[PDB]
Every structure is written in structure tokens, then in C-alpha cells.
Structure 1
Amino acid sequence: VNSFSGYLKLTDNVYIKNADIVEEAKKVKPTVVVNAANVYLKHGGGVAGALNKATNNAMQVESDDYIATNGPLKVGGSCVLSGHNLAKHCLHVVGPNVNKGEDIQLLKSAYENFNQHEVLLAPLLSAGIFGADPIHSLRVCVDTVRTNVYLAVFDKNLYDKLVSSFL
């Protein structure tokens, strides 16, 4: 038993909710919140800008030190940093950005990072300003992630379309 409430169950291990991931993180305080990161950990907009704003820019300060030490992530890769006031940990995962021409096949590699964590609160990777089809992202998530994932979908219209079209 865990504290995630109001989710629709899609499969054995994947759950979905129309919710603001920032508000959901603030209420649940999950062990892991996933950020929709880029390779530079520049949290300017989309989910990342929202999560970072909620940390009063502490996420960005920590991220800049991480990059100065380690260099950029890979597309499809991840790193674990602090969750600040939102979660114990933040798993920064880089899905491909279609608006940069990145290979959509890397979306499966991106979701594989979730399997290193037993339970996660997460957005749909590569959705939103990353330019991928969220229906496709949900399918890759279900077919790749084996650990327990609670997906927060900000847009109600999109949420309803995701549920109604789910196979």
C-alpha cells in the first residue's frame, strides 16, 4: 500500500491521473519524482521549469554543480539528484526532444531508467514541449517500465484522450 490517490489503473504496474506533478509531489512526497530533463539540466520550461520553480531554483543550483563536475547527460540517460522540497530524490531523465531532431527510439532507453526505482511519480517522457506523441509515450512506458509508475498528466483534455485511446 502507498499514498498515491485517485489514479486510474492501466496495467499491473502503471497508473495515471490528471494532475499537476508539482502539486502531486508536494502532497505525496514520493521517494522519487521524475523530471523531464535535458542533457544540460537547464530547467527552463515544461515540467522541468515547473519543478525547478517549486524548489525556489535550488534544483537549478544543484544541477549546475552536477554538470560542472560530470558534463552533460546522454539523451536516453538519467541522474539521481535531490528531490528538495518535492520528494526524497529527483530522477532527471532525458527523453528525446523531437523539436531537436532526436531519435524517438531513444524513448525506450529513457524509460528503462525508471526500472532502477521501485516506485516513481513521473510525467510522460518526451511529451509536452519535447514534441513527441503522448499516446506513443504512454505505450512505450507501459511496454518498458516494470516498476510501479504513477503518471501525472497536466492537461485534462489530453488525460481523457490518453485513457479513452489506451489499449
Structure 2
Amino acid sequence: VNSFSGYLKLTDNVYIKNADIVEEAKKVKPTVVVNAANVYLKHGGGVAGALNKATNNAMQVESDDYIATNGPLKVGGSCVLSGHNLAKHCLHVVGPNVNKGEDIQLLKSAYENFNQHEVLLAPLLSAGIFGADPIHSLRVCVDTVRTNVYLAVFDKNLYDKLVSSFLE
């Protein structure tokens, strides 16, 4: 349980590894895995699509049920649902999509949800199709999160850029 191996320390509580977050979740068995969700919890692509596919659509079925009760999430908000076979819990967090004009300030609010959980396996929020600068997103993470965060970054080129920008 929570057997993280091969992570590089960035700060006392933020670690990083060049790895696939789905493969890590299966090896590590974490208490919490974080999903880079959208407000409708439609796990179509990116991290969200990969995590959902690894549950063979169990996560989407549960998410559809939650959205029928609560309506859409808010940007900056989150919900804790089942982790299915990847984790005990999955924390679905909505970061801002700056392509759509959503406020980059809200990325702080997004990361703040991490502080309700003592250890998390997570991706960088608001990267990819959400349009934010990933190095900037890591800055906000290390400024905001006070609990133990293990970040999985798939792209080796981006991984090297991140480790350079933080330790060089």
C-alpha cells in the first residue's frame, strides 16, 4: 500500500517520477489517485480517459450517476469517488481551462483540494488541452499543497524540463 519507488524529491512534500500514472497506480496501490477532470466528469481523453479505460468504464458509470445528483462541478472544485481497481479513492479535480478564458487564479483553488488527503498520486493540473504552462502549474502545486504529493509525468522531455526548472 502506497509503495512509491523511484521518485525524485523536489521539496519536503512534493515528489516526481517520469512514469505513466495508470501504470504507477496499479503498482503502487495508492490511497488516492487524482484525476484531471472536466466539470461534467466526462472522461474522454488525456489522463481522465486513460484512468477510465483502466477501470473498463466503471469510473464513467459512477461519474454519470454523480453528475445526475449534483449537476456539473465548478472550476476549482472536486469530488471524491471510488478508485475502483486503481486506488481506494479517486479525487476528481477541475483545474481552469485557459483556452476557454477561465481564470488562471483558480489553479490555486484546484490544488487546495489536495490538502484534504494525506498522500496522493497525481498528474499536473491544467496542462495539456487545458492550456496552462506545466512548469507554472508545478510552481502553484509546490506553493499550495501541504500534504504528500507524488507526481507522475509521462513525457520525458517535459520531465527533464520540470526537474531543471525546479532544481537548476
Does TM, normalized by the shorter one, top 0.5? yes
- What is the CA distance between 1:2 and its match in structure 2? 4.9
- Change over 3 Å in CA distance of 1:2–1:34 after alignment to 2: closer
- The range that moved more, 107-116 or 91-100, is 91-100
How far the C-alpha of 1:101 sits from its partner, in A, is 1.4
**Structure 1, unaligned stretches of length 5 or more?**
none
Measured in 1, the distance between the counterparts of 2:69 and 2:91 equals 18
Displacement of 1:100 in angstroms is 1.6
1:166 deviates by 0.9
Q: Which runs of 5+ in 2 are unaligned?
A: none
In the TM superposition, residue 98 of structure 1 has moved relative to its aligned partner by: 1.5
Q: Following TM superposition, where does structure 1 have runs of at least 4 consecutive aligned residues deviating by more than 6 angstroms?
A: none
Could you report, residue by residue, the CA deviation over 1:100-130 in whole angstroms, capped at 9, with x for unpaired residues?
A: 2111100000000000000000000001221
User: How far has the Cα of 1:29 moved from its partner?
Assistant: 1.0
CA apart distance, 1:19: 0.7
Identity %: 100
Residue 166 to residue 122, structure 1, CA distance change in 2 (3 Å): same
Cα RMSD of the aligned pairs, angstroms, is 1.1
Q: 2:2 touches 2:29 (CA, 8 Å); kept in 1?
A: no
SS at match of 1:165: helix
Q: Deviations over 1:111-164 (max 9, x none)?
A: 000000000000000012211100000000000000000000011100000001
Per-residue CA deviation, residues 24-78 of structure 1 (Å, 9 max, x unaligned), is 0011110000000001000010100010011101100000000001111110000
Decide whether the 8 Å contact of 2:21 with 2:154 is kept in 1.
yes
